Amino acid sequence: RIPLQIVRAETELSAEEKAFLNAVEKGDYATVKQALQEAEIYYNVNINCMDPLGRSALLIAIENENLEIMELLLNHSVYVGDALLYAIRKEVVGAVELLLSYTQFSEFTPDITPIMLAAHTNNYEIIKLLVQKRVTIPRPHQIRCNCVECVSSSEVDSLRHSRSRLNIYKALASPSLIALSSEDPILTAFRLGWELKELSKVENEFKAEYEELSQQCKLFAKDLLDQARSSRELEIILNHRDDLAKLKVAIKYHQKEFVAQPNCQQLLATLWYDGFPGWRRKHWVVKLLTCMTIGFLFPMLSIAYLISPRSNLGLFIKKPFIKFICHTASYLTFLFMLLLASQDLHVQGPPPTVVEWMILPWVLGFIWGEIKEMWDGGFTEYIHDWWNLMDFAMNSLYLATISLKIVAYVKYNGSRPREEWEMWHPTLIAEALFAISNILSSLRLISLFTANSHLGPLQISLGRMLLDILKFLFIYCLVLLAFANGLNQLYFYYETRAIDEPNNCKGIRCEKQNNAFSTLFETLQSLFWSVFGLLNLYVTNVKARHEFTEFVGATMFGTYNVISLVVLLNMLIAMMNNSYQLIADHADIEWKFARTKLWMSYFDEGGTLPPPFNIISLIQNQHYQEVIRNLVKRYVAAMIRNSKTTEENFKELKQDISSFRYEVLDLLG
């Protein structure tokens, strides 16, 4: 048998104390009043005694929402320590008002204060009541602060310091506490969410709590925007300066839900189709014909803007959608010329052809536009855009091409057949670089999928899955390098000269593959091409009769095949499935944020002409404050309605019924 006793004993209550606590629980006002009056005289009952659950009489009265018994206990001067915190957590306005007018165990940490707890409960009534007085919340220090106080607190007690910081940020990120006590609730929500996201990044632990607090701030900003009821209010909000300034700030803080607001998107769409008033209601054929017409007329629009910007055609290109169409048409003509550029080849360093002469101004315009964007935007913004990396690569390659061409033009005059050219001849390197540049230039069209409704979210999904692909590539490369090292170690003894080969061809790119694993570089290439099955099996064979060596090499090759294809590739498929399912929910918001950024990029005056043509306050504050006041009122009302539309409710109902029953029985009897 297992004897069961009380290992951690406490102080039991007497019979009279238990009876008094039972009377308090049942809500019998008369018996509780008699017990208090008798305790004043006989001192037989301790009014501050706890229960087996640790609650005192005052805590029992608070938990039952019994205001009469609460006031009766308060009038008899019972212990009140931390009772206000319990009243606030219970979210009972009457208890809070009663207690405001006036080391034991506690359910609240020592750093919790009444205003902080009210903010944690996000109860607008109690938060407003506490802010009516002079209450303050301590300022959290910098995320990476290194002052003496922060390091001293962290070293003395890391748990307490982290808990206090989390409690402070829970208090500040309260939507009700931001609705009050905040000059600009929208900007406060933006920056508070950004700081919470940064804290989530920095704090490896407590990451989920900071992430959810940041998400809560983002949702509060979105709902405040949702409360707008007219286009005038929306324009006032988005144009406020601390045009579309606040929208730009929201984009800066990655407020995807705020930007993808349907009314914000509608306003941005009206700005986007400046020229066409009825683009929303048109047939597919009409839109396609209009887009084709504007694309084919892009040089005329660019020339008209160059000559006279103030005309029906001069300023027609400054419209965002028209500007986007013209830039896309210019890039498409550039790609068409790139395709045509491959339609005498023995000249060493030939002069550029007509197609190359037409291509050159586009390349110069691309370089000039890149450096102009670099100057106008800045450094950090330029480097934050990943597409710019590709642009840089393209430009560099093109520049290299030009350089090499010039070199080949000045260093060579004779016409020698390409068969006997040097391997590192300038023309061959220039042509290879130009081909790579063509590949990258055509691949640059992916970024335009954002402008499309059907292609945008798909591109978002693929870009997000590229992260899982990158994660898997590391372990794949580790396995590939391991097996390459092993196969090269095994096979490098049987390396044969190219002369001994049947066609004087050495390597795996010959008709009969040979020396697949002779060198580490060739072993890497062989193991790569085996993924796609282009490496034949007889490459694991050697001229000598070393059948054990051939079998071991074949076994290494087979194990590599099994791992890379059966195991790693299926695991990659499973990871992609999971990630795509995870990101399918938020694809629309991500796409709309990306498309909003694309649209905003075409609102600026700079960069109007596509290549190659580019180389040739108090009242506003008062209006914003009035609109913000209206939005805050509407948001508070809506959230109260949503909250209004548990076991403690049934406990309160029972308490009310019992109190009424005792009152009636006392009045009658």
Ligand X SMILES: Clc1ccc(Cn2c(CN3CCCC3)nc3ccccc32)cc1
Ligand Y SMILES: CCCCCCCC/C=C\CCCCCCCC(=O)OC[C@H](CO)OC(=O)CCCCCCCCCCCCCCC
Ligand Z SMILES: CCCCCCCCCCCCCCCCCCCC(=O)O[C@H](COC(=O)CCCCCCCCCCCCCC)COP(=O)(O)OCCN
Ligand U SMILES: CC(C)CCC[C@@H](C)[C@H]1CC[C@H]2[C@@H]3CC=C4C[C@@H](OC(=O)CCC(=O)O)CC[C@]4(C)[C@H]3CC[C@]12C
398 binds, among ligand Y, ligand X, a copy of itself, none (CB under 5 to 8 A by kind): ligand X
Shortest Å distance, C-beta 613 to ligand X:
10
C-alpha closest to that of 89 among 111, 67, 59, 68: 59
Helices (H), 412-450: 426-443
C-alpha closest to that of 637 among 176, 27, 190, 150: 176
Q: Identify residues 572-631 at the interface with a copy of itself (CB under 8 A).
A: 577
Selected range binding a copy of itself among 113-121, 178-186, 401-409, 638-646, rule: CB under 8 A: 178-186
C-alpha closest to that of 131 among 147, 150, 114, 148: 114
Query: Considering only residues 445, 473, 562, 574, which one is a binding residue for ligand U as defined by CB under 6 A?
Result: 445
Helices (H), 227-281: 231-238, 245-252, 256-259, 262-272
d(CA 492, CA 305): 66
d(CA 267, CA 255): 17
Q: Does 34 bind ligand POV (CB under 6 A)?
A: no
Shortest Å distance, C-beta 662 to a copy of itself:
16
523-560 burial, b at 16+ Cβ within 10 Å, e below that, comes to bbbbbebbbeeebeeebbbbeeeeeebbebbeebbeeb
Selected range binding a copy of itself among 5-13, 109-117, 481-489, 608-616, rule: CB under 8 A: 5-13
570 binds, among ligand POV, ligand Y, Zn ion, none (CB under 5 to 8 A by kind): none
388 is in an annotated binding site: yes
Q: Does 314 bind ligand Z (CB under 6 A)?
A: no
Q: Does 393 bind ligand Z (CB under 6 A)?
A: yes
Q: Does 93 bind ligand Z (CB under 6 A)?
A: no
Is 635 in contact with 223 (CB distance < 8 Å)? yes
DSSP codes, 507-549:
BSSSSS-B-TTSSHHHHHHHHHHHHTT-S-GGGG--SS--HHH
Q: Does 397 bind ligand POV (CB under 6 A)?
A: yes
Shortest Å distance, C-beta 435 to ligand POV:
10
378 Ramachandran zone, left/alpha/beta (phi>0; psi -120 to 50): left
d(CA 217, CA 650): 33
d(CA 261, CA 259): 5
Shortest Å distance, C-beta 453 to ligand X:
18
Is 408 in contact with 348 (CB distance < 8 Å)? yes
Q: Does 386 bind ligand POV (CB under 6 A)?
A: no
DSSP codes, 286-308:
HHHHHHHHHHHTHHHHHHHHHH-
Q: Identify residues 196-255 at the interface with ligand POV (CB under 6 A).
A: none
Selected range binding a copy of itself among 155-163, 200-208, 402-410, 478-486, rule: CB under 8 A: 200-208
CB closer to ligand Y out of 485 and 620: 485
User: Which residues of the chain form contacts with ligand Y (CB under 6 A)?
Assistant: 479, 554-555, 558-559, 562-563, 566-568
Q: Does 402 bind ligand POV (CB under 6 A)?
A: no
Q: Which residues 6+ apart lie within 8 Å of 246 measured at CB?
A: 186, 187, 237, 238, 239, 240
141 is in an annotated binding site: yes
Shortest Å distance, C-beta 145 to Zn ion:
4
150 is in an annotated binding site: yes
Q: Which residue's CB atom is positioned nearest to ligand U?
A: 452
Query: Considering only residues 194, 206, 368, 529, which one is a binding residue for a copy of itself as defined by CB under 8 A?
Result: 206
Query: Considering only residues 452, 570, 622, 643, which one is a binding residue for ligand U as defined by CB under 6 A?
Result: 452
Q: Does 293 bind ligand U (CB under 6 A)?
A: no
86 binds, among Zn ion, Ca ion, ligand X, none (CB under 5 to 8 A by kind): none
391 binds, among ligand Z, ligand POV, Ca ion, none (CB under 5 to 8 A by kind): Ca ion
Shortest Å distance, C-beta 141 to Zn ion:
3
d(CA 298, CA 318): 12
Task: Give the end-to-end CA distance of the chain in Å, rounded to a whole number.
Answer: 53
> Which x/- pattern over 414-453 shows residues binding ligand POV (rule: CB under 6 A)?
----------x-x--x------x-----------------
Query: Considering only residues 338, 451, 484, 609, which one is a binding residue for ligand U as defined by CB under 6 A?
Result: 451
Distance of CA 609 to the CA centre of its chain: 33
Q: Does 151 bind Zn ion (CB under 5 A)?
A: no
d(CA 443, CA 446): 6
Q: Identify residues 437-466 at the interface with ligand Z (CB under 6 A).
A: 439, 443, 446, 459, 462-463, 466
561 - beta bridge partners?
none
Q: Does 396 bind ligand U (CB under 6 A)?
A: no
Q: Does 410 bind ligand POV (CB under 6 A)?
A: no
Shortest Å distance, C-beta 285 to ligand X:
24
43 binds, among ligand Z, ligand U, ligand POV, none (CB under 5 to 8 A by kind): none
Is 527 in contact with 487 (CB distance < 8 Å)? yes
141 binds, among ligand POV, Zn ion, ligand Z, none (CB under 5 to 8 A by kind): Zn ion
Query: Considering only residues 313, 448, 510, 552, which one is a binding residue for ligand U as defined by CB under 6 A?
Result: 448
Is 603 in contact with 320 (CB distance < 8 Å)? yes
What are residue 53's phi and psi, to 5 degrees?
-95, 0
Binding-site annotation: residue ranges for Zn(2+): 141, 145, 147, 150
Interface ranges with a copy of itself (CB under 8 A): 4-8, 177, 180-183, 202-206, 262-263, 265-266, 269, 280-281, 453, 533, 577
Binding-site annotation: residue ranges for Ca(2+): 370, 373, 388, 391
